[PDB]
Structure formats: C-alpha cells, structure tokens
Design a protein around this nucleic acid. Structure first.
Ligand SMILES: [Cl-]
Ligand SMILES: [Cl-]
Ligand SMILES: [Cl-]
Ligand SMILES: [Cl-]
Ligand SMILES: [Mn+2]
Ligand SMILES: [Mn+2]
Ligand SMILES: [Mn+2]
Ligand SMILES: [Mn+2]
Ligand SMILES: [Mn+2]
Ligand SMILES: [Mn+2]
Ligand SMILES: [Mn+2]
Ligand SMILES: [Mn+2]
Ligand SMILES: [Mn+2]
Ligand SMILES: [Mn+2]
Ligand SMILES: [Mn+2]
Lengths: 84, 96, 97, 108, 92, 103, 78, 97
DNA sequence: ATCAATATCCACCTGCAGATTCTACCAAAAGTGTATTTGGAAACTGCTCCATCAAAAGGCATGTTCAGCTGAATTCAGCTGAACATGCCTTTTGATGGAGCAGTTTCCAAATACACTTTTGGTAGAATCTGCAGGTGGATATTGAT
DNA sequence: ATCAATATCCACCTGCAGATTCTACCAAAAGTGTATTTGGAAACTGCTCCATCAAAAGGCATGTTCAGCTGAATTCAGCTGAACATGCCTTTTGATGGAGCAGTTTCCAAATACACTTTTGGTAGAATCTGCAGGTGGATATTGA
C-alpha cells in the first residue's frame, strides 16, 4: 500500500496540550511537545514489541486486544475494559 | 462450532440489583468489572499458590485464600472480605 | 470591543473541561498509523484488531496524562507553573523509567 | 438423585462457587483444592464487586444518570482511599481523571 | 536438607575465572539470582501456555519468555546458548 | 546425566523437577529443562565474568557482594534486568552530582 | 524507639545517597518514612510467620514480604 | 587552629560512604525498633539473627535510594539542601503516596 | 597558581583469624527400560473481521499577530546547618545457661481426586424496551475593562 | 464598584443506539461410590534465640562560631497564551473481497507413570589461604596568608 513514515508528528501540538490539561497543566514551554513524542514513541515501542511477541508466539498475523492487554500487564501498567 | 466464552456479567448484575435496585450498567462498564474480577481472582489465587508452596503444602485451602486476602487487601476492605468469606465457608460446612 | 480573556484563564477553562471528560484527546486515524508504523518496524504483514489499536490509545493517553500530572508537580516544586523537558526527565527518572 | 442445591446457594452467594472451584484447578495454583477455598474466594470476589458497585452507583446518582458507566467506576475508585490503593496500578478505559487543580495555578 | 545451585555457580565460576574464588555471601547473591530468574522465566512460560490454551511448557515457551524478560542484547546470547543446549542434547 | 548430554554445568534434571513441582503447567517438554538450564547458566557466567573483572580491578581474588554490585550496576543491560533488586552488602556506585562539587 | 535511629546515622545514610547539605527537618521526616517502610514489610512478614504457625520470623518471611512489596532482596535465601 | 570550609567535610563523607557497604545504622537500636513495630502485629515473636539483618539491609537500601532521588529534586529546585518537600515530592512521583 | 602548616589520603609491606577449600561417606534424587495415555500438530473449512475504498461535511490543526506576565538573571542579608572540640552512657562483644521451638515422624480419620451418570445454570441470539445523547433556550455565574 | 462580553448551567425534548428480557441448547456443575493422600494431633529433640553479666571504646549528644545558602525583592526580554482566518484531513457511512482466525476431526511423537539401581549433592570434619586492620612514609589537597 503506502510507506508509513513520520507518523509521530501526527500527535499534534493541540492533542498533546489537551493531555496536559487533563493532567492539570496550565503553561507549556515550546520544547515540551517534542520531548513528549519521544516519551510516547518509547512507550508504544515497548508495548507493541511485547504485544507482537505474544502474537508471533501464538502463530498469528493478527495482533489482538488480548495481546495488548497481556503486554501492558507485563509492563506493570494493567488495563481494564478489553480483557474481554 | 460453539465459540461460547464465559463471563461474570450474570453475577455482577445480580449483585448490582442488590445494592442499587433502580440502576443499570452499560456494557463498557460491565467490561471493566469482569476485568476487575479476573484481576483480583488472579492476585488472590496467585498469592495463595505461593503461600501453599512456601510451606511445602500441596493444597490451597480456605486458610490460604484467607492469608492471600490479608496480604492483598488493605485495612477495612480486608477486614470485611475476611468476614464474608468465613461466614460463607462456615455456612457451607454447616452444609446449610 | 474586541473583548479578550487573559493569559491563563482559557487554560484553566480547558483544564476544568478535560478533567470532567473521558474521551480520547489524541485523534484516531493519526494514531492508528503510528501504531502501524512502529509495529511494522518490528515485524511485517501484521493485522490489528479494531479494539487492539484502541487498547493501546487508552493506555498511551492514560500514561501521558498521568505523566503530565507528575511533571506538573516538579514544575511547581521548581517554583514555576510552566512545565519543561527538564521536569519530564525528572519525573521519569524518579519514576524509575 | 433428589434435589441438587448449588454450592453457591449452600454458601449463600451469588457468585459461582462451582465456576471458581474450576477456574482454580485449571489455573495451576497447586495440585489440590480444598472445597472451602472456591467458596471463600467467591465470597470475597462478590463482596468487592458489591463495594465498588455501591460507590459507582452513588457516582451515577450524583450526576442524574441511572446507568453506571466507566467514568462512574473511576470516580468511585479514585475517591475511596481503599480501592485506590488496591488498584493504583490499574487504568480504566474510558474512565478519565478526578477533577483537581493545584492551588498555585488558580488566579489571585 | 537445603539444596542450592551453590555448587554449580562455582563450576561456572571456574570456567570464566579458574583463578578466582567467591565469598559465602557472594554465593548467596548468586543463588537468589538464579532462583529469581528461574521464577520470572518459569512464570511467563506458565502464562504464555495459558493464554494459548496449551497445557505443557516447552522450549518454545521458555524461549519466548526469555525474549520478553531479558534486555535486548542479553536476550539474544541467551536464546542462542539455549538453542545450542538443546541441539547438542537431542543429537546424541 | 542429562546435563553432560546437554553439555551444561547446570542441573538440567533438578531444573526439570522444579518446573513440574512449582505448578507451571500439567506437562513439561523434554527440552525446556535443558533450555531454561542453558539460559540460567549463560546469565550466571556473564555476571561472574564481570564480577571477576571487578575483583581483579580491585586487586582481589575472592568475589564479595560489593563486586557483584559494581559488576551489575555498571552494566546497562543487567541493570535493566535487576533494577528492582537489591544486593545485600553491595553498597552504591560512587556518583556525586556536579553542582555539589567545590568552586 | 524510632528515635533510636540517630541523626548522624541518617546523615551517614544520606551521604551514601550523595546528599551534601541536610535541612534540619529531614531527620524527623526520615524516621516516619523509615517507620512506614518497616510497618509495611513487617506486617507482611509476620503474616507469613503467623500463617506458617510459628512464633519466629525468619529471613525467609522477610525475603517474601520484601519480594511482594516490590523490594526484592538478594542474599538471604531468595 | 585548622578548619575546613562547610561542605568540604561533607564531600569527604559522601565519597567515603559511597565506597563502603557497611550498614550505617547501629545494630541494637535498630533491632530494638524492629521488635517494637512487629510487636503490634503479633506477640512474643522470636527473630532469626538473619531476619533482623534482612530488614536492616533492605531498609538501608530504601533510604539511600530515596535520598538519591530526594537530592535530584532539591537540585531540580536549584538548591543544594534537601528538605521534607523533596522527600515528599519523590515518594509521591514514586507512587508511595 | 605563591608560601606554609594542617590533615588527608595513597602505598608498600606485615601477620592471624576466620572463612574457605578440600576430605570422607550416605539418602534422595536422576536415570533408565516398559506400559499406556493424550496433548496439540496437520488437514480442510466455515465465516468472522479487517484492510480498502469512495464520498461529502465540517470539526479541528496550522500559522500568524500581539503583548501580558512568566522565567531567569542579580543583588542581598538574615540566620540555618557545617565543622569541631567535649564529655559521657550505651552499643558492641561474647561466652554460657536454659528452653522455647522449628523440624521430624508417626500414625490415621477427614478430606480429595477419580470416574461414569445425569441434571440444570449459562450463554448465544432473537425481541422488546428506554436511558440520555445531542439540540435549544433561557438564566446564571464568571471575567475583566474602567 | 459597576456594566458588557462570554462562557456555564440545567430543565425540557425524542427516538436511536445500546440495553435487558425472553428462548433454546448443551457444556459443565452436581450426584453417589471408591482409592489414596493430606497434614494435622502427641512426642520429642537438638539448636538457634533471649537474657545475663559487664565491662571498654567508641560513637552520640552538646554548645560555639561562622561560612554559605536560601528565599525575598526587582527587572525586563521575549516566550508562550488568546484570538482569528483559512481550509485540510479526519470522521462517519456503507458495502466488499479474502486473509486468516476458530472449529471439527484424525493420529502419532512425546509425556506421564512405575519399578528398579546407577550417581550425586549435601552433610560434618579437617585442612589452609585471602585480607583485614595496623605501621610508616610520602606526596596531596586544603585553607590561612
Ligand atoms: Cl479448605
Ligand atoms: Cl529543559
Ligand atoms: Cl519441549
Ligand atoms: Cl520543607
Ligand atoms: Mn443499596
Ligand atoms: Mn486428546
Ligand atoms: Mn513587553
Ligand atoms: Mn517570576
Ligand atoms: Mn517445648
Ligand atoms: Mn434454566
Ligand atoms: Mn446533554
Ligand atoms: Mn555574614
Ligand atoms: Mn484462507
Ligand atoms: Mn559426591
Ligand atoms: Mn587494607
């Protein structure tokens, strides 16, 4: 289909700012938007790697929400709402 | 080609009517609840497993689940759970 | 005339706003592509369940919102109200990340 | 065979004493399982969901809704010092966060 | 009694530093280590088989468990050392 | 023995008896006790190879707990795998924040 | 008793921790943290002691408490 | 009469104490404290010579590690003197509060 | 850096004490060779789910202008915590006694795992049912220029 | 201490998407009768654990005397909100074609379960090193000058 590249810039300045709000942040320096995508990249990177490791092992091509739930559990970052 | 997969929904909803008769529960909300139940059931049996093992004891009894619960749950939450379990167990042995 | 709210007022409006809501603040499609980009960069020809991509955004947004809370504390301890890379790195470091 | 009461009823519970007894043996927690463990464990499971639903349902009341939803489950969890401790590492999909701003942030 | 990997750590010790020696306290650190790793790996293989409905932990599990727990580069060497260990075994 | 056959110095057999008995699954493959045994041995040599270096670095021939601490903490990868582990009598790596230095 | 943990002992600790200058309120702030730490660990350890029907707390009870409190200790069995 | 600038001795102590591994709390005072805290959970308990040390060991690693982070915060607050605020900030981002 | 006088700290031995490494022998595994037993890897196949796609609307992301008020640079000084010389009571040692108490072990009756048979409580879908989401409309309650 | 421009509030609406109520079939609890197995109740029993006695030698508690740091004031350069105009890229809709799960059946290769018999790892008891703890002597790092 089509080459995927630079999709992190997809997490726009508006979106992030919004997250700071929920997080109760009032003022945001200009440098924080990029330090965020960094952190965000690593987080996804680690969760996906494990999700996928669970898929390859179950001999599948389709990553399940269960794969992801199991991956987050391992990260000590448990999720409710998709367990089933 | 069955496919059927269990769930605790039936039992959550029963307990819901008991506490809040007039209240319903959205699906997404029942989803959280199931996760919650399997989660705790896992924490408690896991601890139970470990406890029975640490003691070269091959069985998980009502006495294991009870320590698992004291180690797992904080203060009041624990003190009430412990009661409910005992009460339920003695009521069961009384074959009641 | 032209009327204008003061610096900080609208921010607070949004803080109060987003804390009362629970919908995903990051846009969907744009997030799905990022998930596909990274995954595909670890293995290929991979499919994703509808809810799999959703179980990730939920966790991701719940992580950053929670991280921005910690970050806020560091800024406020720095006698500031403006968060900076500086604070995120201190939060993550204290967090053991 | 005469009437066959369910172990739950014998225990006075709503949760499945049988299902739990089963989820245990096939979970590989230990070789054997006493008959009073699934009972005791089902009793605690129900008490906890009853506690959470009570506060959740209260959450729903305090906002004119009559159907619990994730947001309500969260407000209850993050407001009950206890549950919060019990699930501090749990993240509830579609739950959001507790409304709360640091004072230093409010205007003069 | 009270068995411990103690004796084997010493053997392995000798292969890498046949001139070096270890302290009783250091030996305790090395057992607590082996037991830990032993638990975390056994643990995940246990889980892995349960997610997939299998009832037997096999090298396949043990290896994916290693992938999931050991840091990037350390995991590779271990996957190797482990795949080798089985080859030499099954052969003769 | 199965370990000499596997070529390992670690108790393949003992590892097998521990898996079956620590409630992990109903059955256990024949190679798993071998594999896991090999994996436990590799990580062991690695730590010892580094702690041994650390002892030598200190003009010593017996490895104490401090040497396992300096060995591990000074390795980004073992550190990541034991970050939530504390070595008794290990002490901490020497490190003083710049600002705290004089002049 | 908690007042048994002396000021210089706390100073010595912080030193190992890399702390150059110590504010006067740290000392009493440290002891509470110290107590809460020990209350949490002991409570768990004694729950294993009591469970194993013994009157003696062993390093193994401390080791398991610490393990589950997320404070894994290498050096006393496990 | 010879004197050292305030701080000079500190650094000397820092360096010394980051080289040693000995327990920095007097044994008895500590063993006395342990028996007490534990006395409010069960009565007349004995203690392995090794149980008391397991705690002292784990415990001193907690404070040392906690002073480490506390210091990062003090420094983050552009100070050089730790204060309860720093210990309070650290324990919180850690999730212990 | 200079000139000097403290203390500190780094090194090259030195010599016992105390852990350590090396011996000498026994139960509890670990191996073997049988005797089934069965978990889950193939061999299709029914059929959910996902990756695509087209399409029209408009909800938001993007840039830019303006300037309010925030972060960072400086100067300062009260006064807090460091560096010390002092003086002592309490923590560190350490054999010894005495005995609580972990283990060990030995039975045995209550408690479980098995097995083969029924007998319903659940779950996957039809069917009917109804919070409240998204729209309006005042009327309040909040901001901020003056 | 107003008043004008917004933003917030919350009571009323109305059928749609999303519950919750039947309905139908089994997968899986519940039923009895066996065949071990568990793991407590008495007894002991060596062995770690308190308690002593009792000093010695530290460290710990104290009171001074500043060196420095922390926190309060003041400024101001310009970073980063609030608003606005423009129009792109996500949303929301409604199928479609197979890609690939999930299911249903066959059949070994492989695992468990016994029984029997090597070997090994773990004890205590010798049988000796690795360094600690201490001396000197010699440059160093500091702080006064
Ligand atoms: Cl029981
Ligand atoms: Cl920064
Ligand atoms: Cl295998
Ligand atoms: Cl403070
Ligand atoms: Mn009620
Ligand atoms: Mn089968
Ligand atoms: Mn200006
Ligand atoms: Mn300012
Ligand atoms: Mn006795
Ligand atoms: Mn029925
Ligand atoms: Mn509405
Ligand atoms: Mn002055
Ligand atoms: Mn196909
Ligand atoms: Mn031997
Ligand atoms: Mn020396």
């Amino acid at each position: 289909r089509k080459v995927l590249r630079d999709n992190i810039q997809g997490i726009t300045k508006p979106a992030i700012r919004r997250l700071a709000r929920r997080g109760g942040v009032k003022r945001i320096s200009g440098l924080i938007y990029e330090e965020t995508r960094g952190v965000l990249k690593v987080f996804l990177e680690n969760v996906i790697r494990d999700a996928v490791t669970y898929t390859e092992h179950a001999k599948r091509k389709t990553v399940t929400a269960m794969d992801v739930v199991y991956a987050l559990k391992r990260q000590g970052r448990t999720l409710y709402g998709f367990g089933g | 080609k069955r496919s059927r997969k269990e769930s605790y929904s039936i039992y959550v909803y029963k307990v819901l009517k008991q506490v809040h008769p007039d209240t319903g529960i959205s699906s997404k909300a029942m989803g959280i609840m199931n996760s919650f139940v399997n989660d705790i059931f896992e924490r408690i049996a896991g601890e139970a497993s470990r406890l029975a093992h640490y003691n070269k004891r091959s069985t998980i009894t009502s006495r294991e689940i009870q320590t698992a619960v004291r180690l797992l749950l904080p203060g009041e939450l624990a003190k009430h759970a412990v009661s409910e379990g005992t009460k339920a167990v003695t009521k069961y042995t009384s074959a009641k | 005339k032209p009327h204008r709210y003061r610096p900080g007022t609208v921010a607070l409006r949004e803080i109060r706003r987003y804390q009362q809501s629970t919908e995903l603040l990051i846009r969907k499609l744009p997030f799905q592509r990022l998930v596909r980009e990274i995954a595909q960069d670890f293995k290929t020809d991979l499919r994703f369940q509808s809810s799999a991509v959703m179980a990730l955004q939920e966790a991701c947004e719940a992580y950053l919102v929670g991280l921005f809370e910690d970050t806020n504390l560091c800024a406020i301890h720095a006698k500031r109200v403006t968060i900076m890379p500086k604070d995120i790195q201190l939060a993550r470091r204290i967090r053991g990340e | 065979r005469a009437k066959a009461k369910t172990r739950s009823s014998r225990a006075g519970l709503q949760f499945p004493v049988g299902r739990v007894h089963r989820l245990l043996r096939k979970g590989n927690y230990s070789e054997r399982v006493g008959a009073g463990a699934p009972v005791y464990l089902a009793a605690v499971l129900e008490y906890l969901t009853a506690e959470i639903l009570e506060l959740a349902g209260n959450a729903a009341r305090d906002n004119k809704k009559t159907r619990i939803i994730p947001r309500h489950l969260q407000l209850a969890i993050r407001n009950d010092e206890e549950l919060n401790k019990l699930l501090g590492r749990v993240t509830i999909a579609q739950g959001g966060v507790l409304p709360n701003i640091q004072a230093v942030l409010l205007p003069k």
